[PDB]
Amino acid sequence: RLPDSGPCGWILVAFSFLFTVITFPISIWMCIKIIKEYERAIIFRLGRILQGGAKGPGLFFILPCTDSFIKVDMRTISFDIPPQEILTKDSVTISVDGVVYYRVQNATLAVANITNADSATRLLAQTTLRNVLGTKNLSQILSDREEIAHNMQSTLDDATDAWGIKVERVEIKDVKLPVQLQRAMAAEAEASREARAKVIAAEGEMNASRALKEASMVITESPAALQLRYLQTLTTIAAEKNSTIVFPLPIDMLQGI
Amino acid sequence: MNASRALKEASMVITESPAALQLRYLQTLTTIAAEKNSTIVFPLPIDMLQ
Ligand code: NA
Questions:
Q1: Are strands A48-49 and A84-87 parallel, antiparallel or unpaired?
Q2: Distance between alpha carbon A78 and the CA centroid of its chain, in Å?
Q3: Inter-chain contact A220–B49, Cβ cutoff 8 Å?
Q4: How far apart are the first and last CA of chain B?
Q5: Which intervals of the chain are annotated as region Required for lipid raft association (chain A)?
Q6: Which residues in chain B have Cβ-Cβ distances shorter than 8 Å to A195?
Q7: What distance in Å separates residue A230's CA from the closest CA in chain B?
Q8: According to DSSP H, which parts of chain A are helical?
């Protein structure tokens, strides 16, 4: 799979052979290359790419005048995506903070078919995450990891194949609602605790009721006692750090008009 | 028009016992109180037994 993108050569090659031998105890260090188990090399000689696949591990020789040399790490790499602003299918504004893991699958395509594989891959992960979550309600986003991952993978594989890249994971490390929505969306949790509080409060009413009845039966034998309790309530209330408005009301004067 | 059928069903059940609609009113007030700039004016009818 190739990427989508002579007599005078021997003279330059011979000149380079001679020059490097003339400079041998210095230039041999530039000629020699060592590629580790987990690396691959892409080599051009007079602009043509050396026949076959990417060069494997071991010891290799190049002439720096006529040859160009690119070295590719084949290991998995992880990148912490910058945070994004997203809209859910139900139209909720959320900000998410992603992470992507990816690996070079074909070293030749990664070098010769795309200008910058890393930037292409990292941007593609952002736009793919933006799209998929726009097809889900907020509740589905929290519950449907496996389905969401499956949807992204097919999208990513179709695009990254030509770049020689395999994306292995995309995941989310933070999700935030804007502050104006936070209590409104929490209604279900708030209601459950209020429901249990109501049961506790009603039990308190029942426990206190007997003493109030006993107090009432004494008070009603001289009914003006309730007005004395009323006036003491006003004195207690006035002491709190709040505004109190009081209206003395001469009812017998009003009774006259 | 789309919402009307469910409201009719809810109304028919609620109206079979008199206090039910009043409970719905009070729950609404509790929901209102959480929003900003919501002033509530609350009468307390009291009897001094004269
Ligand atoms: Na991130």
A1: unpaired
A2: 14
A3: yes
A4: 53
A5: 245-247
A6: none
A7: 9
A8: 7-22, 24-31, 107-112, 117-133, 138-143, 145-160, 182-185, 187-219, 225-238, 251-254
